[PDB]
Amino acid sequence: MREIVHIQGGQCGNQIGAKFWEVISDEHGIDPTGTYHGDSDLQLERINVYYNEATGGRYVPRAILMDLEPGTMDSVRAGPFGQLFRPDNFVFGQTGAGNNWAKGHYTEGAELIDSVLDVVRKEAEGCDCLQGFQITHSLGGGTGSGMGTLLISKVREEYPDRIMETFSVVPSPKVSDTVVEPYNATLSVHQLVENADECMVIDNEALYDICFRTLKLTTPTYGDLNHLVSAAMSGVTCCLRFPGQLNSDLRKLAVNLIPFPRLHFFMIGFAPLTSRGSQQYRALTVPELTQQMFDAKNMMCAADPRHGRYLTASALFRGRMSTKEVDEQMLNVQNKNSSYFVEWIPNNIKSSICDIPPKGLKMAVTFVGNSTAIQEMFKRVAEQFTAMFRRKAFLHWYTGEGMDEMEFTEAESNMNDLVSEYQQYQDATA
Amino acid sequence: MREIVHIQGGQCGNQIGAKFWEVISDEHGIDPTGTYHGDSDLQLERINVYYNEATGGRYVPRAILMDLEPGTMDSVRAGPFGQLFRPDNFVFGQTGAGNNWAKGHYTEGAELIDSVLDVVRKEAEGCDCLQGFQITHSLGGGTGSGMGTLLISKVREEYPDRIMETFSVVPSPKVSDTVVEPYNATLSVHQLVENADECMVIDNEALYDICFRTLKLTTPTYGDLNHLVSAAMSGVTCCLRFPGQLNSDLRKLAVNLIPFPRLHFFMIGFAPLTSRGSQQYRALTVPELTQQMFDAKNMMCAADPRHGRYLTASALFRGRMSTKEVDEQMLNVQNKNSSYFVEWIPNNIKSSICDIPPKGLKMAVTFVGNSTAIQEMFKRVAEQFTAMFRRKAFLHWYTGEGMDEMEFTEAESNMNDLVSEYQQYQDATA
Amino acid sequence: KRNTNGMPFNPITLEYEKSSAGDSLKKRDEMAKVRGYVRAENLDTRSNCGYNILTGEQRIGVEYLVPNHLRDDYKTKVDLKNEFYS
Amino acid sequence: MREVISIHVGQGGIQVGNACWELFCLEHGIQPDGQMPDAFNTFFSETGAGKHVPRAVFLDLEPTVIDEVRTGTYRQLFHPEQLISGKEDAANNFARGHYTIGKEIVDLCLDRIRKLADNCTGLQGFLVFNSVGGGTGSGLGSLLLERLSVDYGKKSKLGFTIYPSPQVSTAVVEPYNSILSTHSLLEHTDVAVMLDNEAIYDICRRNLDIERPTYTNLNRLIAQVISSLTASLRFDGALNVDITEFQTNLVPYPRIHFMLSSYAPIISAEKAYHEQLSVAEITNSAFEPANMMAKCDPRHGKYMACSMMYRGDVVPKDVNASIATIKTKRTIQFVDWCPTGFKVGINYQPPTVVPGGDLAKVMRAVCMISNSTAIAEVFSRLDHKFDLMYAKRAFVHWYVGEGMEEGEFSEAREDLAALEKDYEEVGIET
Amino acid sequence: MREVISIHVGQGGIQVGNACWELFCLEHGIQPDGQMPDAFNTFFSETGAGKHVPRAVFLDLEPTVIDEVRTGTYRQLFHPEQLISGKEDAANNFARGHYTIGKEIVDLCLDRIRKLADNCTGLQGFLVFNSVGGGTGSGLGSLLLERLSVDYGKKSKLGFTIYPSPQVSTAVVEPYNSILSTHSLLEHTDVAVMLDNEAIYDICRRNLDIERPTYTNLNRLIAQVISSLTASLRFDGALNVDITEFQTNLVPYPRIHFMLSSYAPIISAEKAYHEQLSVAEITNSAFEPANMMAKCDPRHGKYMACSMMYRGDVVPKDVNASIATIKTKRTIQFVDWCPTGFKVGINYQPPTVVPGGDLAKVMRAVCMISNSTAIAEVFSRLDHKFDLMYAKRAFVHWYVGEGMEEGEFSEAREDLAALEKDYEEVGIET
């Protein structure tokens, strides 16, 4: 019951999913052949959340994979746990977008999306009670940031009451791999605010910083960043698949973390994270988890959370632990940092406990906090956008496929209005 | 009981039968020497449907092979399972038709057909309870499209209450191998509508498209097209040879799929079909079968089924599966696609379940749907016919053997009337 | 040969009947099968620490999926590129 | 049980018959002595024990060529008394070989034809070879065709005539007898194929890279074309074609049966293997105007119907994918009243190589027989050449004194005018 | 399902095509005979059984180079009739190869292009190679580009032109046809890469330590650059880049698409292994002005956008840590309206070594494609050279007498003046 379907688009989203599904399968004891080989009874009670049942007793994820080029899905199939995905759900084009948002949203993405919407509708109509959808995509690419966001609007138009999740990677100015990143980032943020019920920003720069400083491993690769993102993704829905002292589905988090409908851009972090050589030194206790949870360097975004004030915060503890300690520590982390918490909403931290810890760990915490410090990312994105747009650089590529500069002006104005009205509440006082 | 005899004509029909009988023999465990070597008891209970019994314990098909030239039957005898056919049933002429419909229907086909009708009468009078006849022939050839269709009328005149099947390959304009295809296609369609109880159109172009896109094999050959057609042919009569939850003979399909006596031209498709490299990825489930079953590219005809509305549909599931899932999936495939189903006949999908799956597969589905989209094939055939006939091109070959242009005019008019009255119900509303 | 299909696997069953032509697939796939493991084995690994990013416990090998009947042929094959980019 | 009889008359006919009869003996494994050290039956007959006898007859009034045949290595092959020879040559005079000396020889030839025909049981038709620009060749060919058309009636006869080149000529009086022979075979032959020497000289020069060709090199290419045409009768193939299946596919009207041929690939062993010889490139080369086997430009006229034969390991889907490309091109346009104009045949036996010859061994080849509206140019230029000398009645006394009437020249001119008017009338769109 | 077609015209084009086609065959394991003893599909095509055929066509009017190709070790590889050859050379006259002899050859080339394109299903784009300072090369390249731009339209074409050196020159008239060809490809080619010989001579002398280089050493480096550019289409990588993803990242405006390349490392086996070849040092060497592949100074102008490809075992974090260092340096400054200018690609396959060549085997390499404002100097110096001789109308009679008009020289001068003004207008800060 109350299950969700997985939809991913683009190369970055496909690579994120290729590790997210591996993590989920390892958590539920599903072999790469789709056969259950788990140890505990609880591993099968709520498997309908992510997995479907077919004849022969094997399980198949309800994931939908889409891209405008076939290479990435032809590569993910040969990887581990690549056989679980149903071949029918693979939809792709023969041309690609070339990191051009217009091509992936107006000319090419519009004709292809009917086929993927057909299978999306097939998956949603069938399921017992829908909880919602979760979306993984990147804002630094053309086909992803175009087709995914248009699909968001199409899904929202047909299921207005369901919940919608988006895990979005925004292009940081530090590690830049594409010159046209500001254009399709700014165009995508315009559409994303209007339809997504929840959005979670993730930055490659913050992932590299975490890998270099906390784990202290010499050579980070995309596999480590994907593993961290996958652990963070799994931590959110853990209590929906396992029993606990205070169950809290996604809708309950939506109620408690979004004060106003347009303020739904969160930054997350996962604890504990320790190096291989120091994993024996540390002792896992609730104070040790909560001190690392609110650490500024532990956030999955380069945004500095002590440059603003938290509107609200959430924590999803895992493992068996006493609730009194959790509540007193949450109170203590809020009394010692009163300057960084907005004062006109008292008791702005939500807590939840799940009795099933991750495989290999005795305690774990997932942190989701809505803070005013996120304005800095939109500020720098808009700064680069307005630095590049004033000369009409690279504009002809977009304008040759039916798009105009008016949609750029409206997007810039709406993004600046969002930036302004997000900080409006930072200076608000009672 | 309720058995049928096999009659095939022409080179294309002989090549189709040469694989159909191999598939049937492999299904029933009959060696190419006519000796049973099967494993299951059910393999012998209903073997009287297709095979006769002779002294020495060997089995012989009740097939009749006819052609106007001896080469094709002299070649099929040397192939595998070629010894099963009784030498007495081979009837042939010494001249041939040369792809001329008039020669194969008026001058040469009229004198020879007495001998083949003698053996046809011998086969039908003897059998326990007749169910009917099934005919395989091609509309792109002269001798086939002439002699087969005249034999249809002769059989119908003597057995008006029995059922008659025809698997007809119509010449597509994409892959054309004969210049005089429109003439003998149009002449044959005129006679075929008046006598055949059921007709199933098959196109080489659709078979090549399927082989190139779904199976993704590099070099298709006639053996693969024949194998697909043979699997589709076997799927229809499976429940008549094996037990099941809801047995449904050919007459029951005739009742439920033909609303009006002149609308009996179906297009079919077989599922599942997967590539060699992806046969391990996929998991066989009822949703996976039904999503591929209604796929437009899976149809054995180039006609696009989302260009019209289904009058009715049928599905013949194979293997052991729950009926509740089948019914709910059939309902779901009809609620999500209400625009493509005619509205004045509710619940227009028939389902059947057979507990014996094909050898090597755990589940299989055969789809037979009567749709209004078939008009496009007759439209293009008539377009080519009227483009060629207006100049009286190649007309002297036909008119030199007692035929006249009046029979061409009547055939064109009747075919156009069929095209019009078939789409008349597409725009009909309640 | 008009009635025997181009390849050993009939589309309906997508499977083979034993003889060399059938055997090549039950053979080439063993080869072809091995090649796929190595890049996938490789792609996550060069990027990967080998030790879990947070726990730090030593990682596990990907060797389990391939059947042990062909376990050794895969052995030498992985090393040939191991030396090439050694 | 399928047979064909080839007739060779005149020096050119005998010299091309020798060329085809090395090739057939080599292709069926028969040694020059006639002894093998069931496909032979089309061209040969079994004598009961040992040698095989060709189903061919050689005719000539001038004894030199026959005497050369009866002393070469093939002296033991042919039956001694089917090499009918005369004493006095016609000496390029058409009236001689039609009225004076051919009549006394034609009876023996007809007796031999009857004696060969009574042996065959499945006679498909006759083949005849004759160089048109000679007395005995044209005259005896005309007389034999006229006798056969009434002795046998509806049996099919095929004529591989060699018309004179546009400007290159060996005689000075060949237009007269060429026009008269065209008159004679216009109403008496079912198929006529164009074979002028200049085009084949250009083919040899450009492709075979021979700067000094002789008649043998031309005759070997003609023999290869004949073998490609008749391969389908004696070898197994996925898509067979019979001789009787031509007038139903290439001959729109009884008067129009002159068509021109082409062959591909033509390449030497020194540079053949450096390129892959795909089916697409060979079928493109076959349609090149410079590779026509008759010196006519297809770009100057429409196409009516194309019958083109493949042999080797070609797959039908690759053939269809190449027919589509040709239909795409804007430089090749078909007539309005013919939507599809291609008849395709596929055979498995690759072309055989003759040792010491020019062509190399290849696995794929294509031979096309195409009927086009552009053929009227050769008739127009031959007519213009005829009129120049007939204005002054030059060389007429050599014909009037051999029994021919004065008015016989005019009616051939009228029939050519009628043919040219008919070709113009057919090619106009509706 | 992704393909690309490479066009080689002129002596320099054919001699660099040979250089790239040893490298591709070596990199994909294909023997020179074309036989292997799924990544090949980008450059090759499967013939069904055995050999592979390159997707390349060789053009030249002068037969010597093609004859050398057709007799070397690679005689069996290329298809025999895609090596189009003429009879008469253009002799460094541009008007000849654009108006007199190139027109009669261009039709065959276009037919070959169509025959190759119909085979591809996912055609990414075209590649073309031509030395600019020659008659046939520049003229036929211009004519082919002009025909392709209208036959296909939006398909991408890439041009690897070799402009003359600042002072070193082989001809005396090459500025004229260089300017005319720049005129022709300015409005017709999507990407143009600079390749003058003097810079590569200096690279060989300084790094490879060869004091007497020949053209083969230059062509091998160019082939390595091409392989590095196209590696991402046929090998798995953590950060892929497609050809269509260029005009969205390197081309700010439709007129500005001339950029200059560089490669690193370039080192011999005698001293390669003594140093570690870290990613930081190779990415520093790639940006050195002395390692530009075209003799232009980047210190004289701003950068617009840098697209730079890695291959080997490089980790993204090390790439980011090196992009930061380059942004730090004060000697490299980017244009004001471009905050981020780097597009990064990472591939896993290390560069392959050719036996007997100059370069050694290394595990890391970097190839950069950078668009900079400093490129205007080559245009200015070519313009100055052109004006000196056009003042007195020298050598003009060799062009006017080949069908070209008198005024055609002036408008190329005006377009170069427009381009130089545009480059100055873009580089000024706001």
Ligand SMILES: Nc1nc2c(ncn2[C@@H]2O[C@H](COP(=O)(O)OP(=O)(O)OP(=O)(O)O)[C@@H](O)[C@H]2O)c(=O)[nH]1
């Ligand atoms: N293709 C081809 N044409 C030939 C050959 N020999 C002769 N011809 C043509 O035949 C024409 C003349 O007819 P011939 O066959 O030589 O002589 P004929 O048909 O026996 O007639 P007579 O002169 O009466 O003996 C010439 O114009 C030649 O073009 C040959 O070996 N090959």
Ligand SMILES: Nc1nc2c(ncn2[C@@H]2O[C@H](COP(=O)(O)OP(=O)(O)OP(=O)(O)O)[C@@H](O)[C@H]2O)c(=O)[nH]1
């Ligand atoms: N990099 C490089 N440049 C070459 C090579 N061969 C010739 N060139 C350049 O090409 C210019 C002249 O054009 P070519 O390619 O030699 O001759 P073409 O393009 O065939 O034109 P034609 O003279 O009419 O035959 C010279 O200035 C050379 O700099 C080569 O092998 N490598």
Ligand SMILES: Nc1nc2c(ncn2[C@@H]2O[C@H](COP(=O)(O)OP(=O)(O)O)[C@@H](O)[C@H]2O)c(=O)[nH]1
């Ligand atoms: N975490 C992670 N990020 C990736 C990976 N591959 C690419 N990216 C990021 O995705 C961005 C490029 O997105 P792109 O591939 O063009 O998206 P697309 O246009 O939808 O295909 C880069 O800035 C990378 O930082 C990966 O394997 N893991």
Ligand SMILES: Nc1nc2c(ncn2[C@@H]2O[C@H](COP(=O)(O)OP(=O)(O)O)[C@@H](O)[C@H]2O)c(=O)[nH]1
């Ligand atoms: N599926 C299949 N179709 C075939 C085969 N052989 C021929 N055909 C089709 O049959 C058509 C020609 O029919 P034809 O042989 O002239 O029929 P006939 O006149 O009765 O002998 C062609 O268009 C082919 O597409 C075969 O082996 N398998």
Ligand SMILES: [Mg+2]
């Ligand atoms: Mg003679």
Ligand SMILES: [Mg+2]
């Ligand atoms: Mg040259």
